[PDB]
Amino acid sequence: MIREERLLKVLRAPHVSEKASTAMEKSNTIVLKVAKDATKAEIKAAVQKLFEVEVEVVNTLVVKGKVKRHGQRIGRRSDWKKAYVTLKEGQNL
Amino acid sequence: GKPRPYSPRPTSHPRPIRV
Amino acid sequence: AVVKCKPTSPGRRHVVKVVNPELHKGKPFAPLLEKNSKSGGRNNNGRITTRHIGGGHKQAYRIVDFKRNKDGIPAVVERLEYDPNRSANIALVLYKDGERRYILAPKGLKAGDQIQSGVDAAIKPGNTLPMRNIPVGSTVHNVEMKPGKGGQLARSAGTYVQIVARDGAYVTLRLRSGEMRKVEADCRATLGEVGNAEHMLRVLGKAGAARWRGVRPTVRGTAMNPVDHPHGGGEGRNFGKHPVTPWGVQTKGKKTRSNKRTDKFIVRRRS
Amino acid sequence: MKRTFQPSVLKRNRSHGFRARMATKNGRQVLARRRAKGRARLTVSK
RNA sequence: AGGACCGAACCGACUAAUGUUGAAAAAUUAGCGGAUGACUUGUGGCUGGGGGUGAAAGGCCAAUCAAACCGGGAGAUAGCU
RNA sequence: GCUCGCCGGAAGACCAAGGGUUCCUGUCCAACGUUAAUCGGGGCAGGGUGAGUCGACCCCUAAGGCGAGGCCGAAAGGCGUAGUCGAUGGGAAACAGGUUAAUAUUCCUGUACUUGGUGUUACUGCGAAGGGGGGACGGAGAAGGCUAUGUUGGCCGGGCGACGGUUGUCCCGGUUUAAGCGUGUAGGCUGGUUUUCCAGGCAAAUCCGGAAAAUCAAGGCUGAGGCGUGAUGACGAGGCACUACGGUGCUGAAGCAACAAAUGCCCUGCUUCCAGGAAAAGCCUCUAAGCAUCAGGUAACAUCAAAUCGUACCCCAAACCGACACAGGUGGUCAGGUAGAGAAUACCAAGGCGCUUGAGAGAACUCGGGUGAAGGAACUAGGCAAAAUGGUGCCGUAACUUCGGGAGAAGGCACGCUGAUAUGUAGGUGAGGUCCCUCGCGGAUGGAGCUGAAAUCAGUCGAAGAUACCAGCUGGCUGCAACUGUUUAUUAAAAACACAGCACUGUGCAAACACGAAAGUGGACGUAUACGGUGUGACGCCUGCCCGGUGCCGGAAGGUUAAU
Ligand SMILES: *[C@H]1O[C@H](CO)[C@H](O)[C@H](O)[C@H]1NC(C)=O
Ligand SMILES: [Mg+2]
Ligand SMILES: [Mg+2]
Ligand SMILES: [Mg+2]
Ligand SMILES: [Mg+2]
Ligand SMILES: [Mg+2]
Ligand SMILES: [Mg+2]
Ligand SMILES: [Mg+2]
Ligand SMILES: [Mg+2]
Ligand SMILES: [Mg+2]
Ligand SMILES: [Mg+2]
Ligand SMILES: [Mg+2]
Ligand SMILES: [Mg+2]
Ligand SMILES: [Mg+2]
Ligand SMILES: [Mg+2]
Ligand SMILES: [Mg+2]
Ligand SMILES: [Mg+2]
Ligand SMILES: [Mg+2]
Ligand SMILES: [Mg+2]
Ligand SMILES: [Mg+2]
Ligand SMILES: [Mg+2]
Ligand SMILES: [Mg+2]
Ligand SMILES: [Mg+2]
Ligand SMILES: [Mg+2]
Ligand SMILES: [Mg+2]
Ligand SMILES: [Mg+2]
Ligand SMILES: [Mg+2]
Ligand SMILES: [Mg+2]
Ligand SMILES: [Mg+2]
Ligand SMILES: [Mg+2]
Ligand SMILES: [Mg+2]
Ligand SMILES: [Mg+2]
Ligand SMILES: [Mg+2]
Ligand SMILES: [Mg+2]
Ligand SMILES: [Mg+2]
Ligand SMILES: [Mg+2]
Ligand SMILES: [Mg+2]
Ligand SMILES: [Mg+2]
Ligand SMILES: [Mg+2]
Ligand SMILES: [Mg+2]
Ligand SMILES: [Mg+2]
Ligand SMILES: [Mg+2]
Ligand SMILES: [Mg+2]
Ligand SMILES: [Mg+2]
Ligand SMILES: [Mg+2]
Ligand SMILES: [Mg+2]
Ligand SMILES: [Mg+2]
Ligand SMILES: [Mg+2]
Ligand SMILES: [Mg+2]
Ligand SMILES: [Mg+2]
Ligand SMILES: [Mg+2]
Ligand SMILES: [Mg+2]
Ligand SMILES: [Mg+2]
Ligand SMILES: [Mg+2]
């Protein structure tokens, strides 16, 4: 059992894109930006407790930040974790 | 000014030997 | 048997091979196998300390019994095996209590023949007695130098030791070198001669055959520059130096034995 | 032609990496010199 | 069977022409040698500078070698320009 | 968009390594791009990498590293034991189809599999850091059985031809389907089973090893492929409907056989040889201490878990190593057609490209090629370069020789196409049917169909039949080195180095010797038929005279001579 304090720190944002939109209307799946240290179990616990929906399986990947230039000074965006969270048959978010 | 000179590079012809 | 190859290729013309058909064609006895990775003549500093060592065929080490401590229990020779670690052939022997061991294969010893070690052992080849229980004039191999240490003298192909004289607690041994050395009477020897005496009649025939046995080329001192070797240098073939090792020590007759601890056991040198 | 630099990250790290430096007193003196000079990158590790 | 024979891959480098501020700080093109072996190749490991390693050419040891490279003694010394 | 050309054992495809956003989309063209650029691996912004099964991590070790104590060393440190790390090796499990602008064995659909935890039920000797088995291993060669795969026929759908002919022995296309589960075949290995005892396996052992009976001779292990199921599904040439002309929606025929056939599989096999061919764990089994109607073990069923990190993209290259969008370098995997011995070569397929300045002109001269009258090495240091030879079969083949060679010596003859022999032969393959049958993936007989050289005879076309590409020049005398090898990365490949063989010499093992202030380590888990050093250099015939000098080895009457 995971503390609610920990479950409130693993979901950062819903990820908005065409692939996220397509996944939500085709494979009843929600795409979330999650904490980089979050586990599949913690994501599957947090979504169920904070959105009151039934989760089938969590798929996760780590997005490597891009090297960007801002006034001929090289910089790097932070790496973040993306969660493909598959809900059951009829739940809706 | 002048750029740093190159290390030795291949030479097309032998220096003539005078002896 | 010593068989000459036919000159079908130039590298086979001079080849003389020792074809022994009484050798186990199958795999060796696994329980008495250890790995022994090669050195390339390099020590724990990673430096070449013995030149001309490297490559050659991968070899597993056969745990050979040189001690022959298992006394009173009769042993039958199962098969003669090829051993890549030594010039001698080795015999796989089965004692009457189940235990199997490798021994140096003495001349004559075949499969079926019975061997036995100890004080009351019979006087026949393969049998290992303490040398005070072996008659004077006998021919022996796998001779211990200290009681219980295991055989160190006369292990190589066709080698043997003659027990010439027994005096008190010591026996005098004529070694293959021609040396007369004293050893403790208690020290164990195996009767007979070490087999595979035709081992010296082999002609490797080509450079590669040496490279198979793990020997790398010897470069002559006189072929080098002075910086590399005392014999180095010269316009054309020159020498004009007393022959020396790569390290300046004279190499054509200079005695290098310096062991005052073991001098007392030497009755007469080879000279 | 084969040039002298044939990259391997494993060999790089083992030969020059942070832990390799820390393993010997001379290696630790390298780190001390580089910190003293104020290098942004102490070793190849990064 | 073979350090066997012919010959691609693969490894090499005998000849010629080209190129020589190159396409290339060692190549290209046409021929050339080895091609089951003392062969060749990937990965990792070990050997350190009067030291290594060398089938030995003073060869090779990061485009550097009759003593590597980097920092230091150091503004060596220079009856020379 | 049409045509043209180029690669196609690659200039295609998939990776590792390495790089790190170069990927996809929109937008911009200053700079970057050897030109312009609307384009880009360029600028800017947004997107994109989804795993119990792939890989890492992880368990296990190799070389080697580190190394508690320890031994050693002025200090720093060196070595190494117990250990602990270290892959390039060993160790559980997923396949086909579909899908995105960009990921997919990761998403979806269908159908699987593995390991562990927990619970239930039944039955029960469980238990290791220990013992045994296993894991577990070389080179070469050979043959059979196979599949990938291809070809042809059948089958199905479509076609009837821009110019003579084309309803046929005609043309084009398709003819695909996995893991898993079941079966247990070609082949390979081994004789089972029971009882009794035992100086062995650090102790024990029901396991292993050994010994002694008894009975039965067919039992076990291993194993490609095939076949069945998986699959009433999926895919499917095209056609019917929408086209924002990018691509969505919808339906769906045949889906068989024969022959050929790998370098892949059976095969970690088999045969053979000498140079004699990792380790450890997982796994299987055995008990010890211990635990005794308990824990734990075995089986079935149910449920739960399988985290974390990588996953885009390039990868013989414009993204890696070469300062460059550089004719260079870079390990693994895949391997279609015709001809061919072939992964050579030529032309093609799939697929990918035309190499990021063009346009003219048609001087010398340079480069890379083609051809050449007569002559034919007169060239030149030298036939340098070029020209030439070049395949297969048969015939034929010198000196010399270590009897293997030399040898493809040299030299001569034949070669296409068509018909016949024979509507396609020898050979290979092998259906239906019949018969036997311990009844199956069987055996025997049987030659339907399929595939298919080589040769002979006859005819026939060309100047030429090895027609292209491809593909030895040959012979004679002689120096040197026996030979295959090795070498001056980048002006020297040799007669130099090495080499088998030979000899001398050292070396008795705590070996000589070498690396090391030392401990140690190599030599060697070797032991004089061994090991080091030196010189010589296959083989054959041989290797003479000299010991004064300088080394070395041995002797010792005296003379001299150190510290003390
Ligand atoms: C070029 O000259 C160097 C000396 O500077 C060398 O001699 C080299 O071999 C020369 N190369 C040529 C082709 O002559
Ligand atoms: Mg999933
Ligand atoms: Mg993942
Ligand atoms: Mg100036
Ligand atoms: Mg030697
Ligand atoms: Mg020699
Ligand atoms: Mg020289
Ligand atoms: Mg000298
Ligand atoms: Mg001379
Ligand atoms: Mg002289
Ligand atoms: Mg050959
Ligand atoms: Mg070379
Ligand atoms: Mg070439
Ligand atoms: Mg050859
Ligand atoms: Mg060849
Ligand atoms: Mg010289
Ligand atoms: Mg260099
Ligand atoms: Mg110097
Ligand atoms: Mg000074
Ligand atoms: Mg100065
Ligand atoms: Mg960018
Ligand atoms: Mg792009
Ligand atoms: Mg421009
Ligand atoms: Mg861009
Ligand atoms: Mg180790
Ligand atoms: Mg310590
Ligand atoms: Mg250590
Ligand atoms: Mg480990
Ligand atoms: Mg690995
Ligand atoms: Mg892609
Ligand atoms: Mg087939
Ligand atoms: Mg092959
Ligand atoms: Mg990819
Ligand atoms: Mg390139
Ligand atoms: Mg370009
Ligand atoms: Mg290559
Ligand atoms: Mg080709
Ligand atoms: Mg012209
Ligand atoms: Mg011209
Ligand atoms: Mg011409
Ligand atoms: Mg002419
Ligand atoms: Mg003419
Ligand atoms: Mg003529
Ligand atoms: Mg002339
Ligand atoms: Mg002239
Ligand atoms: Mg020529
Ligand atoms: Mg020519
Ligand atoms: Mg002459
Ligand atoms: Mg030669
Ligand atoms: Mg040669
Ligand atoms: Mg050179
Ligand atoms: Mg050269
Ligand atoms: Mg020792
Ligand atoms: Mg010589």
PDB file of N, CA and C (backbone and C1' of nucleotides) in Angstrom, chain A residues 66-70 77, chain F residues 22-27 43-47:
ATOM      1  N   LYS A  66      15.456  17.857 -25.396  1.00  0.00           N
ATOM      2  CA  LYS A  66      16.124  18.365 -26.624  1.00  0.00           C
ATOM      3  C   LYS A  66      17.217  19.367 -26.237  1.00  0.00           C
ATOM      4  N   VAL A  67      18.316  19.384 -26.997  1.00  0.00           N
ATOM      5  CA  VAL A  67      19.375  20.434 -26.934  1.00  0.00           C
ATOM      6  C   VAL A  67      18.894  21.629 -27.763  1.00  0.00           C
ATOM      7  N   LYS A  68      18.540  22.734 -27.098  1.00  0.00           N
ATOM      8  CA  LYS A  68      18.029  23.982 -27.731  1.00  0.00           C
ATOM      9  C   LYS A  68      19.075  25.092 -27.598  1.00  0.00           C
ATOM     10  N   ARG A  69      19.051  26.054 -28.527  1.00  0.00           N
ATOM     11  CA  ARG A  69      19.934  27.252 -28.537  1.00  0.00           C
ATOM     12  C   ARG A  69      19.085  28.499 -28.262  1.00  0.00           C
ATOM     13  N   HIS A  70      19.532  29.338 -27.319  1.00  0.00           N
ATOM     14  CA  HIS A  70      18.854  30.597 -26.902  1.00  0.00           C
ATOM     15  C   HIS A  70      19.900  31.715 -26.814  1.00  0.00           C
ATOM     16  N   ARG A  77      16.772  20.897 -22.393  1.00  0.00           N
ATOM     17  CA  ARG A  77      15.489  20.683 -21.673  1.00  0.00           C
ATOM     18  C   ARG A  77      15.608  19.407 -20.833  1.00  0.00           C
TER      19      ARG A  77
ATOM     20  P     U F  22      17.093  17.487 -34.958  1.00  0.00           P
ATOM     21  O5'   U F  22      17.535  16.403 -36.048  1.00  0.00           O
ATOM     22  C5'   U F  22      18.204  16.841 -37.253  1.00  0.00           C
ATOM     23  C4'   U F  22      18.993  15.689 -37.825  1.00  0.00           C
ATOM     24  C3'   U F  22      18.197  14.444 -38.227  1.00  0.00           C
ATOM     25  O3'   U F  22      17.570  14.627 -39.488  1.00  0.00           O
ATOM     26  C1'   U F  22      20.333  13.891 -37.267  1.00  0.00           C
ATOM     27  P     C F  23      15.975  14.497 -39.658  1.00  0.00           P
ATOM     28  O5'   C F  23      15.673  13.193 -38.785  1.00  0.00           O
ATOM     29  C5'   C F  23      15.958  11.883 -39.329  1.00  0.00           C
ATOM     30  C4'   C F  23      14.854  10.939 -38.920  1.00  0.00           C
ATOM     31  C3'   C F  23      13.430  11.442 -39.189  1.00  0.00           C
ATOM     32  O3'   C F  23      12.966  10.937 -40.434  1.00  0.00           O
ATOM     33  C1'   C F  23      13.664  10.880 -36.885  1.00  0.00           C
ATOM     34  P     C F  24      12.311  11.903 -41.541  1.00  0.00           P
ATOM     35  O5'   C F  24      10.896  12.200 -40.859  1.00  0.00           O
ATOM     36  C5'   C F  24       9.857  11.203 -40.931  1.00  0.00           C
ATOM     37  C4'   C F  24       8.639  11.729 -40.216  1.00  0.00           C
ATOM     38  C3'   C F  24       8.138  13.104 -40.671  1.00  0.00           C
ATOM     39  O3'   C F  24       7.358  12.986 -41.851  1.00  0.00           O
ATOM     40  C1'   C F  24       8.216  13.029 -38.313  1.00  0.00           C
ATOM     41  P     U F  25       7.226  14.208 -42.887  1.00  0.00           P
ATOM     42  O5'   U F  25       6.440  15.269 -41.982  1.00  0.00           O
ATOM     43  C5'   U F  25       5.019  15.091 -41.777  1.00  0.00           C
ATOM     44  C4'   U F  25       4.485  16.219 -40.927  1.00  0.00           C
ATOM     45  C3'   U F  25       4.717  17.644 -41.448  1.00  0.00           C
ATOM     46  O3'   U F  25       3.813  17.990 -42.488  1.00  0.00           O
ATOM     47  C1'   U F  25       5.198  17.560 -39.142  1.00  0.00           C
ATOM     48  P     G F  26       4.228  19.038 -43.638  1.00  0.00           P
ATOM     49  O5'   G F  26       4.162  20.408 -42.810  1.00  0.00           O
ATOM     50  C5'   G F  26       2.872  20.894 -42.370  1.00  0.00           C
ATOM     51  C4'   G F  26       3.061  22.120 -41.509  1.00  0.00           C
ATOM     52  C3'   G F  26       3.858  23.276 -42.125  1.00  0.00           C
ATOM     53  O3'   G F  26       3.064  24.080 -42.989  1.00  0.00           O
ATOM     54  C1'   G F  26       4.609  22.877 -39.917  1.00  0.00           C
ATOM     55  P     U F  27       3.720  24.831 -44.253  1.00  0.00           P
ATOM     56  O5'   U F  27       4.722  25.835 -43.512  1.00  0.00           O
ATOM     57  C5'   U F  27       4.178  26.998 -42.842  1.00  0.00           C
ATOM     58  C4'   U F  27       5.277  27.696 -42.080  1.00  0.00           C
ATOM     59  C3'   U F  27       6.448  28.229 -42.917  1.00  0.00           C
ATOM     60  O3'   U F  27       6.134  29.477 -43.522  1.00  0.00           O
ATOM     61  C1'   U F  27       7.281  27.069 -41.035  1.00  0.00           C
ATOM     62  P     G F  43      20.118  23.712 -37.321  1.00  0.00           P
ATOM     63  O5'   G F  43      19.470  25.141 -37.627  1.00  0.00           O
ATOM     64  C5'   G F  43      20.238  26.331 -37.336  1.00  0.00           C
ATOM     65  C4'   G F  43      19.314  27.520 -37.379  1.00  0.00           C
ATOM     66  C3'   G F  43      18.089  27.457 -36.462  1.00  0.00           C
ATOM     67  O3'   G F  43      18.400  27.869 -35.140  1.00  0.00           O
ATOM     68  C1'   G F  43      17.407  28.062 -38.626  1.00  0.00           C
ATOM     69  P     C F  44      17.810  27.083 -33.866  1.00  0.00           P
ATOM     70  O5'   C F  44      16.254  27.427 -34.026  1.00  0.00           O
ATOM     71  C5'   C F  44      15.813  28.773 -33.717  1.00  0.00           C
ATOM     72  C4'   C F  44      14.332  28.903 -33.982  1.00  0.00           C
ATOM     73  C3'   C F  44      13.418  27.894 -33.277  1.00  0.00           C
ATOM     74  O3'   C F  44      13.215  28.224 -31.909  1.00  0.00           O
ATOM     75  C1'   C F  44      12.776  28.091 -35.530  1.00  0.00           C
ATOM     76  P     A F  45      13.050  27.081 -30.785  1.00  0.00           P
ATOM     77  O5'   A F  45      11.568  26.570 -31.113  1.00  0.00           O
ATOM     78  C5'   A F  45      10.459  27.451 -30.817  1.00  0.00           C
ATOM     79  C4'   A F  45       9.183  26.894 -31.401  1.00  0.00           C
ATOM     80  C3'   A F  45       8.752  25.501 -30.929  1.00  0.00           C
ATOM     81  O3'   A F  45       8.171  25.522 -29.630  1.00  0.00           O
ATOM     82  C1'   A F  45       8.514  25.649 -33.265  1.00  0.00           C
ATOM     83  P     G F  46       8.302  24.261 -28.631  1.00  0.00           P
ATOM     84  O5'   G F  46       7.300  23.232 -29.342  1.00  0.00           O
ATOM     85  C5'   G F  46       5.875  23.442 -29.207  1.00  0.00           C
ATOM     86  C4'   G F  46       5.136  22.511 -30.136  1.00  0.00           C
ATOM     87  C3'   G F  46       5.286  21.007 -29.879  1.00  0.00           C
ATOM     88  O3'   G F  46       4.502  20.511 -28.799  1.00  0.00           O
ATOM     89  C1'   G F  46       5.581  21.422 -32.162  1.00  0.00           C
ATOM     90  P     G F  47       4.998  19.248 -27.930  1.00  0.00           P
ATOM     91  O5'   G F  47       4.994  18.091 -29.038  1.00  0.00           O
ATOM     92  C5'   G F  47       3.751  17.392 -29.288  1.00  0.00           C
ATOM     93  C4'   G F  47       3.857  16.582 -30.556  1.00  0.00           C
ATOM     94  C3'   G F  47       4.426  15.169 -30.410  1.00  0.00           C
ATOM     95  O3'   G F  47       3.425  14.266 -29.958  1.00  0.00           O
ATOM     96  C1'   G F  47       5.446  16.253 -32.247  1.00  0.00           C
TER      97        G F  47
END
